[PDB]
Amino acid sequence: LKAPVVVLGAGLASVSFVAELRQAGYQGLITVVGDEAERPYDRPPLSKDFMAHGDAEKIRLDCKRAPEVEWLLGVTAQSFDPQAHTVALSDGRTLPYGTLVLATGAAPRALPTLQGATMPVHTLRTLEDARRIQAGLRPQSRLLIVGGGVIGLELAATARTAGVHVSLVETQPRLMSRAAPATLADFVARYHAAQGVDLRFERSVTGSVDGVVLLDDGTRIAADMVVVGIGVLANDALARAAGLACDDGIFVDAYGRTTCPDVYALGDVTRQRNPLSGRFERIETWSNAQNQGIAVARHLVDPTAPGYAELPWYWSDQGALRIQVAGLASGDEEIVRGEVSLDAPKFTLIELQKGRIVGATCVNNARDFAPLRRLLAVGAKPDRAALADPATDLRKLAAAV
Amino acid sequence: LKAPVVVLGAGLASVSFVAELRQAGYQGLITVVGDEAERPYDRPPLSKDFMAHGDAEKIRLDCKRAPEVEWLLGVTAQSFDPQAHTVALSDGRTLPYGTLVLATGAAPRALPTLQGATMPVHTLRTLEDARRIQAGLRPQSRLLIVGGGVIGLELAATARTAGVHVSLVETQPRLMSRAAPATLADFVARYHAAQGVDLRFERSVTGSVDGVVLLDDGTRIAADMVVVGIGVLANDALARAAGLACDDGIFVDAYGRTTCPDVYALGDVTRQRNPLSGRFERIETWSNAQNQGIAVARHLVDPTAPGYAELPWYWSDQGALRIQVAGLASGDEEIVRGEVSLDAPKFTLIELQKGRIVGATCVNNARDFAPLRRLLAVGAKPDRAALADPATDLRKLAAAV
Numbered sequence: 001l002k003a004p005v006v007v008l009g010a011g012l013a014s015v016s017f018v019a020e021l022r023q024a025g026y027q028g029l030i031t032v033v034g035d036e037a038e039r040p041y042d043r044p045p046l047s048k049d050f051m052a053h054g055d056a057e058k059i060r061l062d063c064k065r066a067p068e069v070e071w072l073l074g075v076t077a078q079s080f081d082p083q084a085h086t087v088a089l090s091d092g093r094t095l096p097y098g099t100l101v102l103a104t105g106a107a108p109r110a111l112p113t114l115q116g117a118t119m120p121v122h123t124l125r126t127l128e129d130a131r132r133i134q135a136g137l138r139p140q141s142r143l144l145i146v147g148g149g150v151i152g153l154e155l156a157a158t159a160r161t162a163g164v165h166v167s168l169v170e171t172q173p174r175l176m177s178r179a180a181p182a183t184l185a186d187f188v189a190r191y192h193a194a195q196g197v198d199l200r201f202e203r204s205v206t207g208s209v210d211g212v213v214l215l216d217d218g219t220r221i222a223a224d225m226v227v228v229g230i231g232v233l234a235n236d237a238l239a240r241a242a243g244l245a246c247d248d249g250i251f252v253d254a255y256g257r258t259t260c261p262d263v264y265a266l267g268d269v270t271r272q273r274n275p276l277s278g279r280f281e282r283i284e285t286w287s288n289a290q291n292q293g294i295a296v297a298r299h300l301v302d303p304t305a306p307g308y309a310e311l312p313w314y315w316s317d318q319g320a321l322r323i324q325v326a327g328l329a330s331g332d333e334e335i336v337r338g339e340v341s342l343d344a345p346k347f348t349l350i351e352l353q354k355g356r357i358v359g360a361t362c363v364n365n366a367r368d369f370a371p372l373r374r375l376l377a378v379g380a381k382p383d384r385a386a387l388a389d390p391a392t393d394l395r396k397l398a399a400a401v
Numbered sequence: 402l403k404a405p406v407v408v409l410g411a412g413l414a415s416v417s418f419v420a421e422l423r424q425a426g427y428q429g430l431i432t433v434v435g436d437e438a439e440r441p442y443d444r445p446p447l448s449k450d451f452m453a454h455g456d457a458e459k460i461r462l463d464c465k466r467a468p469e470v471e472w473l474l475g476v477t478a479q480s481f482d483p484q485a486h487t488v489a490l491s492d493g494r495t496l497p498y499g500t501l502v503l504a505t506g507a508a509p510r511a512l513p514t515l516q517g518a519t520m521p522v523h524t525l526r527t528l529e530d531a532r533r534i535q536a537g538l539r540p541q542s543r544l545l546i547v548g549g550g551v552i553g554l555e556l557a558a559t560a561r562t563a564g565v566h567v568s569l570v571e572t573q574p575r576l577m578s579r580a581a582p583a584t585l586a587d588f589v590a591r592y593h594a595a596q597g598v599d600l601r602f603e604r605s606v607t608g609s610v611d612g613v614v615l616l617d618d619g620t621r622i623a624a625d626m627v628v629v630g631i632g633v634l635a636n637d638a639l640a641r642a643a644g645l646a647c648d649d650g651i652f653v654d655a656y657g658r659t660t661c662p663d664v665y666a667l668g669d670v671t672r673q674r675n676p677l678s679g680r681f682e683r684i685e686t687w688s689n690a691q692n693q694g695i696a697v698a699r700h701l702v703d704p705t706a707p708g709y710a711e712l713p714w715y716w717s718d719q720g721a722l723r724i725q726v727a728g729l730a731s732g733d734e735e736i737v738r739g740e741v742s743l744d745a746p747k748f749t750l751i752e753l754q755k756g757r758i759v760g761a762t763c764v765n766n767a768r769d770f771a772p773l774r775r776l777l778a779v780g781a782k783p784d785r786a787a788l789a790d791p792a793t794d795l796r797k798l799a800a801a802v
């Protein structure tokens with residue numbers, strides 16, 4: 001930890017990191033360069049309460065635990081020179097650094113087939129995006145969402161609640177193929193269908209003409225707006241240019257170190273080890289952004305602290321469904337607690353591998369989620385009959401381990 | 402480049418690196434720890450001329466260009482402490498380092514279904530392996546090879562030449578699925594079949610009983626010996642333990658830097674950027690081992706030298722077929738020069754993407770290979786009619802660019 005500290009990006013990972021630096025006791029210079037001209041804010045509301053209620057002052061991140069930080073908002077870092085230990089900014093200034101931290105996140109992947117479209121096509125990542133989408137979210141309007149992932153489905157639910165007609169195109173035979181159990185994805189598809197979402201599976205957009213979207217099955221979908229949610233690509237251009245190991249994401253170890261001395265990275269821009277799979281993955285969860293940012297900061301201030309070690313988890317709020325998912329999407333067995341029904345949805349899934357809990361899902365069952373994460377963390381191997389048994393208290397079972 | 406230099410592993414990548422350090426002008430200490438108690442040697446002969454002729458003094462690597470290097474042969478590096486800058490050796494000694502280089506390569510992946518077998522099952526990676534296999538390679542014996550990759554097929558050819566009956570089981574519908582054009586793989590399968598190799602495609606070993614191998618189609622193959630060639634796994638255990646970013650291979654940039662200050666890696670143990678695909682891959686070729694070792698050394702001695710930048714290529718000698726393959730296995734088009742025939746096999750493949758040469762294969766046509774690699778290197782976009790035309794001289798075409 002060499003002063004001064006410069007952080008590129010002013011999202012959740014950046015804020016979490018700088019607050020932890022200060023809290024851990026680092027009092028040297030911290031300068032944060034953020035390309036959006038926005039007080040740092042949290043993104044999940046953009047698909048939900050913000051999209052619905054429009055108040056950005058309800059979604060700002062609290063920078064209170066990060067005192068004495070200079071935030072350069074509306075400035076783009078253009079390059080860094082890792083030999084000179086400098087960063088070049090879009091406003092013509094240069095920042096020196098002792099330690100450079102890349103927290104530049106990811107940007108929505110564009111749909112190559114809609115590139116030259118002449119109807120509204122938006123992605124949903126920023127406050128600017130949400131405002132632009134929002135300004136077209138009139139009741140009875142026709143929305144086409146491309147991509148049946150977390151963001152697409154969160155938007156789908158919000159749009160339906162607002163009285164917008166929603167069609168959604170997904171290339172896979174299922175929703176949420178990236179980070180959800182099949183059982184969950186099947187249920188989620190049935191829920192959205194029942195709420196009036198027109199789901200199109202195993203279909204791709206081949207292009208568009210005068211407000212009509214064309215599909216690979218040779219059919220059409222007329223829409224007033226297309227929102228594309230087909231994933232993100234890491235904002236790793238500065239790292240690539242400077243010679244760091246990257247591949248749609250900057251490779252880091254559990255200390256957040258890149259392959260370049262004195263340059264660290266954290267959050268959505270990183271490819272890191274998933275301790276459950278033991279594979280490198282871009283982990284794009286809110287919890288990763290916060291906890292990885294905190295872990296890297298903690299270890300920079302105190303080298304005796306452990307590396308980042310948290311197991312991955314996320315939530316997704318989709319209308320009546322409060323979904324929570326931890327760990328791996330599958331194992332050799334799934335245990336279902338509760339019935340899976342559109343009538344007052346409430347259930348839990350537990351994924352096991354060779355008797356060990358490797359994943360869990362809760363739908364409208366937050367009570368169960370925290371104990372399951374504890375069981376997951378220690379690689380617990382509880383009685384599978386007990387795990388299935390409705391009489392079992394998971395919080396009690398977790399404590400017993 | 403801080404002295405002293407310690408290299409873990411004494412294979413081709415290690416030898417290439419240390420020779421280049423000396424040639425580039427580094428004269429400080431170099432100590433190489435090699436777990437095999439063997440004068441450093443080259444591995445390709447082990448599936449061919451060594452397997453056939455048995456003279457290990459014909460396969461040693463020339464360490465002449467690496468003067469004043471201490472080679473600790475028959476010693477295993479057990480761990481390194483990247484804070485203390487020390488390496489712990491199996492003989493109880495500790496080495497200090499200014500710069501640590503991990504060149505520990507890869508080890509044959511074992512077949513989980515043959516783990517408790519009671520017939521000879523060998524892998525083919527070392528001189529010890531080759532000698533053990535060789536001592537069972539009697540004419541008229543029955544050899545089963547598992548895996549239809551480069552090593553399996555090189556061994557298959559050598560075994561057939563020696564009068565050994567050869568059956569070969571492959572899980573994929575094709576041979577060499579990892580790094581060969583389909584057109585090549587199809588031809589290679591026809592060649593081996595014509596030489597008497599009993600090929601079993603889309604089959605897996607489910608186990609074995611008293612000298613009989615069991616398959617997933619529910620059938621049997623009796624054999625006197627099984628050689629397993631189903632790929633390798635990076636020898637990255639020390640890196641993993643020490644906190645470096647690894648995932649079946651140590652991630653490095655074009656300078657060979659790992660995520661750990663003062664620790665580099667090179668050769669088969671590395672995951673690195675393939676400049677043609679722009680993706681990270683474990684590149685396990687002989688040419689990578691040499692050229693990456695040289696590039697990393699060159700840049701350590703002279704920081705103004707460029708990073709490693711070579712495009713991937715390899716050869717495979719399989720009986721009458723002298724195969725050479727460069728770049729990517731496929732593009733949007735393949736151009737074939739010559740006819741593809743078992744009657745005096747001689748042909749060239751050129752893979753193009755958006756008109757640019759992105760890959761090439763030569764079978765018994767070495768003359769064409771070097772010019773095609775030059776065309777590949779500069780991303781040439783020659784006239785496709787000229788590329789197809791038999792009257793075209795590729796060496797002349799390359800020079801014209």
Ligand SMILES: Cc1cc2nc3c(=O)[nH]c(=O)nc-3n(C[C@H](O)[C@H](O)[C@H](O)COP(=O)(O)OP(=O)(O)OC[C@H]3O[C@@H](n4cnc5c(N)ncnc54)[C@H](O)[C@@H]3O)c2cc1C
Nearest residue numbers: 009011012013035043044077104105267268285286289314
């Ligand atoms: C619509 C939406 C809904 C979401 N809902 C959920 C959810 O339900 N569950 C969940 O787990 N997560 C959710 N996420 C939240 C998401 O997980 C976090 O926002 C993300 O993980 C934060 O990661 P980050 O801080 O690394 O990156 P970012 O938030 O992307 O921040 C990086 C910042 O750096 C900026 N930047 C990039 N390059 C430069 C440069 N050169 N110079 C200066 N600045 C630069 C970027 O523009 C960006 O402002 C949602 C996200 C969106 C967009």
Ligand SMILES: Cc1cc2nc3c(=O)[nH]c(=O)nc-3n(C[C@H](O)[C@H](O)[C@H](O)COP(=O)(O)OP(=O)(O)OC[C@H]3O[C@@H](n4cnc5c(N)ncnc54)[C@H](O)[C@@H]3O)c2cc1C
Nearest residue numbers: 410412413414436444445478505506668669686687690715
């Ligand atoms: C049978 C066979 C046939 C081949 N034919 C071809 C071919 O046709 N074309 C082609 O391109 N390539 C061929 N290859 C050659 C291959 O590409 C090279 O041998 C390889 O790329 C060399 O890489 P390396 O030096 O990084 O690793 P290695 O050669 O594996 O050397 C690493 C060395 O480090 C040692 N080591 C590992 N851990 C430790 C430790 N902790 N302490 C000390 N020492 C350690 C290993 O045991 C090994 O001796 C073939 C290989 C084999 C085995």
Ligand SMILES: NC(=O)c1ccc[n+]([C@@H]2O[C@H](COP(=O)([O-])OP(=O)(O)OC[C@H]3O[C@@H](n4cnc5c(N)ncnc54)[C@H](O)[C@@H]3O)[C@@H](O)[C@H]2O)c1
Nearest residue numbers: 147148149150151152170171176179229230231232284314
């Ligand atoms: N578990 C998580 O990783 C998680 C959870 C919540 C939020 N997030 C945030 O959301 C971001 C990604 O959001 P997203 O929902 O856009 O991506 P996503 O990966 O969650 O889903 C994209 C979906 O689009 C589909 N798709 C891909 N190409 C397509 C195409 N051409 N046409 C139609 N469908 C296509 C995929 O199959 C997938 O179902 C992340 O960066 C992260 O910050 C991530």
Ligand SMILES: NC(=O)c1ccc[n+]([C@@H]2O[C@H](COP(=O)([O-])OP(=O)(O)OC[C@H]3O[C@@H](n4cnc5c(N)ncnc54)[C@H](O)[C@@H]3O)[C@@H](O)[C@H]2O)c1
Nearest residue numbers: 548549550551552553571572577580630631632633685715
């Ligand atoms: N192009 C190259 O990367 C290249 C070229 C020459 C030599 N080499 C050397 O060879 C090593 C790998 O050699 P290899 O031939 O053993 O691996 P390989 O990857 O070349 O081929 C392994 C083959 O086994 C098949 N396979 C995987 N699992 C199987 C299973 N369970 N049952 C049956 N088949 C299975 C794969 O489909 C593949 O065709 C590398 O480390 C490298 O050092 C590499």
